[PDB]
């Protein structure tokens, strides 16, 4: 066919009920997922050919960073509960990757500050219950598919893109490729 099992997509062999439409897994420490937000606006680039009425979700992971990438993941869960992901993705970033200035859950706080995130309620965010479980939904979401690497999608708890099986000389051509696997495998 054109699209075949094992090329641009794989399929898992324990799929995973009532999970997320599009799930996608990054970690602020992990190159390619840099790439992914910054250069590709692979996130972006799924939506917009996504069907009527699907909905999209990000994780961060534990498995890189140590330390500071726990406090990554609650730091995510605490933009997830205040609905800041899009003020503080790139910092967050560039941060980590670029600048390097990020090397402490202070720093990462200064990051929420500067994006204009309000001291006493980051704190809150930070320490509320619904953040808690909230970090325990991006590790349970990571943990049934088994996750070892980043960045990675899943679609409807049965099917993960495949991005090695696609042409990288042009970067336009990739996403294109990529956002159309996932429209494909939605419509499954």
């Known amino acids: 066919a054109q699209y075949e099992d094992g090329k641009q997509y794989t399929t898992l062999e ?7 439409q599009v799930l996608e897994f990054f ?10 937000e910054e250069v590709l ?12 009425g699907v909905k999209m979700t990000k994780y961060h992971v ?23 992901e899009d003020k503080v993705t790139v910092p967050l970033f560039e941060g980590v990757q670029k600048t390097q200035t990020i090397r402490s859950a202070s720093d990462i706080r200064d ?16 320490n509320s219950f619904v953040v808690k479980s909230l970090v325990a939904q991006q590790e349970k979401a990571a ?3 088994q996750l070892r690497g980043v960045p990675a999608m899943f679609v409807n708890g049965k099917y993960q893109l495949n991005p090695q099986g696609m042409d990288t000389s042009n970067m336009d051509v990739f996403v294109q490729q990529y956002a159309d696997t996932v429209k494909y495998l939605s419509e499954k």
């Open 27 to 36: 970690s602020f420490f992990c190159p390619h997922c840099y790439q992914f």
């Open 41 to 52: 606006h692979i996130s972006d680039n799924v939506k917009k050919k996504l069907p009527e």
């Open 62 to 84: 534990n498995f890189m960073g140590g330390d500071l990438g726990k406090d990554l993941t609650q730091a995510w869960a605490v933009a997830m509960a205040l609905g800041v």
């Open 14 to 20: 324990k799929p995973v009920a009532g999970a997320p």
């Open 143 to 145: 943990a049934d598919v």
């Open 111 to 126: 990051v929420f500050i500067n994006a204009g995130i309000k001291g006493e309620e980051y704190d809150a965010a930070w």
